Amino acid sequence: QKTPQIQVYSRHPPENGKPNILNCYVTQFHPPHIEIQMLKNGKKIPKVEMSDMSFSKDWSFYILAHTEFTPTETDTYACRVKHASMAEPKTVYWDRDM
Amino acid sequence: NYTFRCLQMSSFANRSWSRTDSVVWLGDLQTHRWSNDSATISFTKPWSQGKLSNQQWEKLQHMFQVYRVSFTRDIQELVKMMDYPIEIQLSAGCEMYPGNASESFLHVAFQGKYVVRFWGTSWQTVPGAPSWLDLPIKVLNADQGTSATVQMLLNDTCPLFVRGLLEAGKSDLEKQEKPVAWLSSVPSSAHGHRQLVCHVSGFYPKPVWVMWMRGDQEQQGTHRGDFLPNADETWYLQATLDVEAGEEAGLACRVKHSSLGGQDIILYW
Ligand SMILES: CCCCCCCCCCCCCCCC(=O)OC[C@H](COP(=O)(O)O[C@@H]1[C@H](O[C@H]2O[C@H](CO)[C@@H](O)[C@H](O)[C@@H]2O)[C@H](O)[C@@H](O)[C@H](O)[C@H]1O[C@H]1O[C@H](CO)[C@@H](O)[C@H](O)[C@@H]1O)OC(=O)CCCCCCCCCCCCCCC
Ligand SMILES: *[C@@H]1O[C@H](CO)[C@@H](O[C@@H]2O[C@H](CO)[C@@H](O[C@@H]3O[C@H](CO[C@H]4O[C@H](CO)[C@@H](O)[C@H](O)[C@@H]4O)[C@@H](O)[C@H](O[C@H]4O[C@H](CO)[C@@H](O)[C@H](O)[C@@H]4O)[C@@H]3O)[C@H](O)[C@H]2NC(C)=O)[C@H](O)[C@H]1NC(C)=O
Ligand SMILES: *[C@@H]1O[C@H](CO)[C@@H](O)[C@H](O)[C@H]1NC(C)=O
Ligand SMILES: *[C@@H]1O[C@H](CO)[C@@H](O)[C@H](O)[C@H]1NC(C)=O
């Protein structure tokens, strides 16, 4: 029973007003059952595509979530994950500077 | 050079709920998916059938169809002699070396831990696997048609199939996509310090060099993150550098990739 790690990054260089794709990449969890939400200002984002689940050489599962997004000065974007290993949902926020 | 992997993911939640989904990878490119909801294996590439005819492909798809069913109830049958939830994973395929050489593998994990392998001509429990596996595995070994089938697949079918995959998917496997790169920074926890970030996105194949430079001198403080997948079958990586306030001037990020043509990308902070 392993805890998920979350990395949130953009596909292209962010620039305010320009269409982009935001990735949320959830690794290292087990068992494979899991709920991934991508959030805009705390509202769940509707049209979110997920990859097929897979696992690495070390057996832990990983999964790629992604949505279209146009970043602005004022919008925050997050990735929230429910999993059996965690008492509590984990949220990591996109930080264009990190 | 190329690892081909068929990855099985089987969850048994109870006496009558179970699912088995798979994905097949040739290197870092997905070739197939097979959903528990689905009768037939799905192609995720125009070339996913490789050099095989329709007759050969159906035959091979048939043997996996009987396998998905039999695996399910052999496992269920096993549990009802013994504790749910059960998660079983299986990783099967071959590593393709240059000079037409190769090595096959068939590894099985239980509860996220490697426990059983197929090796040579029999199934084996891996050292320190639970002892209760010994009897089921000796019993499965007594089934010669299954064991002859697995040897056949591992020894012949896998490398044979992969060779046609590599031919048929040459323009995807040998594709070049350029990295586009950008810089940002962020405070760090120690006062008067910063972390410069060099992000490199959209590149293919995987091998890349990303380093923070001061002129010709590599900044050995460069800290490479992990390769992160994009969704368009390209890669993402970032390299951070912790620096002192003021000391930022003249730092560059330089990236080398096979598709850039020997002209590195150099960004200046
Ligand atoms: C994308 C393309 C890439 C291609 C390259 C792939 C490279 C990787 C290869 C991966 C192959 C993986 C192996 C699958 C191969 C296969 O065909 O298996 C079929 C076999 C077929 O068996 P089956 O039961 O269906 O039938 C048997 C056999 O059938 C014969 O006929 C089949 C075709 O019709 C063939 O597939 C098979 O090879 C064989 O020729 C057996 O040989 C017979 O002796 C037996 O009688 C038969 O039994 C059936 O009939 C009886 C009725 O009289 C019943 O008693 C019985 O229930 C069944 O109906 O079923 C099983 O053995 C399932 C059990 C496998 C489990 C191993 C995992 C180890 C577990 C790890 C432990 C985890 C912890 C546990 C947690 C508690
Ligand atoms: C698919 O490919 C695999 C190879 O990857 C083949 O598996 C090999 O098959 C042969 C023949 O079945 C095996 O050879 C036999 O091994 C016995 C000793 O094994 C030990 O030693 C070797 C290395 O020293 C280890 O690899 C192995 O794990 C053991 O520790 C020998 O004692 C046997 O010889 C005796 O019995 C035979 C009967 O078969 C007699 O003919 C002999 O004269 C002798 O008295 C025998 O040579 C070999 O070990 C297997 N390889 C591995 C690594 O396990 C599959 O055959 C192949 N399948 C197909 C269908 O192509
Ligand atoms: C089997 O497991 C699933 C939970 O994933 C559940 O919906 C189903 O009711 C279970 N069966 C019972 C009644 O134990
Ligand atoms: C997976 O497939 C089997 C056989 O088709 C089916 O009976 C089972 O309900 C499926 N699992 C789920 C959870 O849908």
JSON list of C-alpha atoms and ligand atoms in Angstrom, two decimals, chain B residues 103 119-121 124 148 151-152 154-156, ligand 2:
[
{"chain": "B", "resi": 103, "resn": "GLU", "atom": "CA", "xyz": [15.90, -12.01, -23.91]},
{"chain": "B", "resi": 119, "resn": "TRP", "atom": "CA", "xyz": [12.03, -19.04, -16.55]},
{"chain": "B", "resi": 120, "resn": "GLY", "atom": "CA", "xyz": [13.37, -21.59, -19.01]},
{"chain": "B", "resi": 121, "resn": "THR", "atom": "CA", "xyz": [10.69, -24.26, -18.97]},
{"chain": "B", "resi": 124, "resn": "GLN", "atom": "CA", "xyz": [9.15, -20.39, -10.30]},
{"chain": "B", "resi": 148, "resn": "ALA", "atom": "CA", "xyz": [4.80, -25.40, -23.82]},
{"chain": "B", "resi": 151, "resn": "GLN", "atom": "CA", "xyz": [7.90, -21.11, -23.94]},
{"chain": "B", "resi": 152, "resn": "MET", "atom": "CA", "xyz": [6.62, -20.83, -27.52]},
{"chain": "B", "resi": 154, "resn": "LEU", "atom": "CA", "xyz": [8.50, -16.08, -24.96]},
{"chain": "B", "resi": 155, "resn": "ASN", "atom": "CA", "xyz": [11.06, -17.86, -27.16]},
{"chain": "B", "resi": 156, "resn": "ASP", "atom": "CA", "xyz": [9.58, -17.24, -30.64]},
{"chain": "C", "resi": 2, "resn": "LIG", "atom": "C1", "xyz": [12.82, -21.51, -24.40]},
{"chain": "C", "resi": 2, "resn": "LIG", "atom": "O1", "xyz": [14.10, -21.10, -23.94]},
{"chain": "C", "resi": 2, "resn": "LIG", "atom": "C2", "xyz": [14.63, -21.66, -22.76]},
{"chain": "C", "resi": 2, "resn": "LIG", "atom": "C3", "xyz": [16.01, -21.05, -22.62]},
{"chain": "C", "resi": 2, "resn": "LIG", "atom": "O2", "xyz": [15.80, -19.70, -22.27]},
{"chain": "C", "resi": 2, "resn": "LIG", "atom": "C4", "xyz": [14.70, -23.17, -22.83]},
{"chain": "C", "resi": 2, "resn": "LIG", "atom": "O3", "xyz": [14.87, -23.60, -21.50]},
{"chain": "C", "resi": 2, "resn": "LIG", "atom": "C5", "xyz": [16.05, -24.43, -21.38]},
{"chain": "C", "resi": 2, "resn": "LIG", "atom": "O4", "xyz": [15.77, -25.78, -21.73]},
{"chain": "C", "resi": 2, "resn": "LIG", "atom": "C6", "xyz": [16.80, -26.74, -21.58]},
{"chain": "C", "resi": 2, "resn": "LIG", "atom": "C7", "xyz": [16.24, -28.10, -22.02]},
{"chain": "C", "resi": 2, "resn": "LIG", "atom": "O5", "xyz": [14.91, -28.25, -21.54]},
{"chain": "C", "resi": 2, "resn": "LIG", "atom": "C8", "xyz": [17.33, -26.76, -20.15]},
{"chain": "C", "resi": 2, "resn": "LIG", "atom": "O6", "xyz": [18.45, -27.64, -20.05]},
{"chain": "C", "resi": 2, "resn": "LIG", "atom": "C9", "xyz": [18.34, -28.63, -18.99]},
{"chain": "C", "resi": 2, "resn": "LIG", "atom": "O7", "xyz": [18.83, -28.13, -17.74]},
{"chain": "C", "resi": 2, "resn": "LIG", "atom": "C10", "xyz": [19.28, -29.01, -16.71]},
{"chain": "C", "resi": 2, "resn": "LIG", "atom": "C11", "xyz": [20.11, -28.25, -15.69]},
{"chain": "C", "resi": 2, "resn": "LIG", "atom": "O8", "xyz": [19.51, -26.99, -15.49]},
{"chain": "C", "resi": 2, "resn": "LIG", "atom": "C12", "xyz": [20.26, -26.25, -14.53]},
{"chain": "C", "resi": 2, "resn": "LIG", "atom": "O9", "xyz": [21.43, -25.70, -15.10]},
{"chain": "C", "resi": 2, "resn": "LIG", "atom": "C13", "xyz": [21.27, -24.62, -16.02]},
{"chain": "C", "resi": 2, "resn": "LIG", "atom": "C14", "xyz": [22.63, -23.99, -16.23]},
{"chain": "C", "resi": 2, "resn": "LIG", "atom": "O10", "xyz": [23.63, -24.89, -15.80]},
{"chain": "C", "resi": 2, "resn": "LIG", "atom": "C15", "xyz": [20.25, -23.55, -15.57]},
{"chain": "C", "resi": 2, "resn": "LIG", "atom": "O11", "xyz": [19.94, -22.71, -16.67]},
{"chain": "C", "resi": 2, "resn": "LIG", "atom": "C16", "xyz": [18.98, -24.16, -14.98]},
{"chain": "C", "resi": 2, "resn": "LIG", "atom": "O12", "xyz": [18.15, -23.19, -14.40]},
{"chain": "C", "resi": 2, "resn": "LIG", "atom": "C17", "xyz": [19.34, -25.20, -13.92]},
{"chain": "C", "resi": 2, "resn": "LIG", "atom": "O13", "xyz": [19.93, -24.59, -12.77]},
{"chain": "C", "resi": 2, "resn": "LIG", "atom": "C18", "xyz": [20.15, -30.13, -17.26]},
{"chain": "C", "resi": 2, "resn": "LIG", "atom": "O14", "xyz": [20.42, -31.00, -16.19]},
{"chain": "C", "resi": 2, "resn": "LIG", "atom": "C19", "xyz": [19.42, -30.88, -18.37]},
{"chain": "C", "resi": 2, "resn": "LIG", "atom": "O15", "xyz": [20.25, -31.89, -18.90]},
{"chain": "C", "resi": 2, "resn": "LIG", "atom": "C20", "xyz": [19.82, -33.23, -18.54]},
{"chain": "C", "resi": 2, "resn": "LIG", "atom": "O16", "xyz": [18.46, -33.53, -18.88]},
{"chain": "C", "resi": 2, "resn": "LIG", "atom": "C21", "xyz": [18.19, -33.46, -20.28]},
{"chain": "C", "resi": 2, "resn": "LIG", "atom": "C22", "xyz": [16.69, -33.57, -20.57]},
{"chain": "C", "resi": 2, "resn": "LIG", "atom": "O17", "xyz": [16.19, -32.32, -21.01]},
{"chain": "C", "resi": 2, "resn": "LIG", "atom": "C23", "xyz": [19.04, -34.49, -21.02]},
{"chain": "C", "resi": 2, "resn": "LIG", "atom": "O18", "xyz": [18.80, -34.38, -22.41]},
{"chain": "C", "resi": 2, "resn": "LIG", "atom": "C24", "xyz": [20.53, -34.24, -20.72]},
{"chain": "C", "resi": 2, "resn": "LIG", "atom": "O19", "xyz": [21.37, -35.17, -21.37]},
{"chain": "C", "resi": 2, "resn": "LIG", "atom": "C25", "xyz": [20.83, -34.18, -19.21]},
{"chain": "C", "resi": 2, "resn": "LIG", "atom": "O20", "xyz": [20.94, -35.46, -18.59]},
{"chain": "C", "resi": 2, "resn": "LIG", "atom": "C26", "xyz": [18.99, -29.94, -19.50]},
{"chain": "C", "resi": 2, "resn": "LIG", "atom": "O21", "xyz": [20.09, -29.67, -20.36]},
{"chain": "C", "resi": 2, "resn": "LIG", "atom": "C27", "xyz": [17.79, -25.35, -19.80]},
{"chain": "C", "resi": 2, "resn": "LIG", "atom": "O22", "xyz": [18.29, -25.31, -18.48]},
{"chain": "C", "resi": 2, "resn": "LIG", "atom": "C28", "xyz": [16.67, -24.32, -19.97]},
{"chain": "C", "resi": 2, "resn": "LIG", "atom": "N1", "xyz": [17.17, -22.99, -19.73]},
{"chain": "C", "resi": 2, "resn": "LIG", "atom": "C29", "xyz": [16.99, -22.32, -18.58]},
{"chain": "C", "resi": 2, "resn": "LIG", "atom": "C30", "xyz": [17.83, -21.10, -18.43]},
{"chain": "C", "resi": 2, "resn": "LIG", "atom": "O23", "xyz": [16.21, -22.64, -17.67]},
{"chain": "C", "resi": 2, "resn": "LIG", "atom": "C31", "xyz": [13.43, -23.76, -23.45]},
{"chain": "C", "resi": 2, "resn": "LIG", "atom": "O24", "xyz": [13.63, -25.08, -23.88]},
{"chain": "C", "resi": 2, "resn": "LIG", "atom": "C32", "xyz": [12.95, -23.02, -24.69]},
{"chain": "C", "resi": 2, "resn": "LIG", "atom": "N2", "xyz": [11.72, -23.61, -25.12]},
{"chain": "C", "resi": 2, "resn": "LIG", "atom": "C33", "xyz": [11.42, -23.82, -26.40]},
{"chain": "C", "resi": 2, "resn": "LIG", "atom": "C34", "xyz": [10.11, -24.52, -26.61]},
{"chain": "C", "resi": 2, "resn": "LIG", "atom": "O25", "xyz": [12.13, -23.48, -27.36]}
]
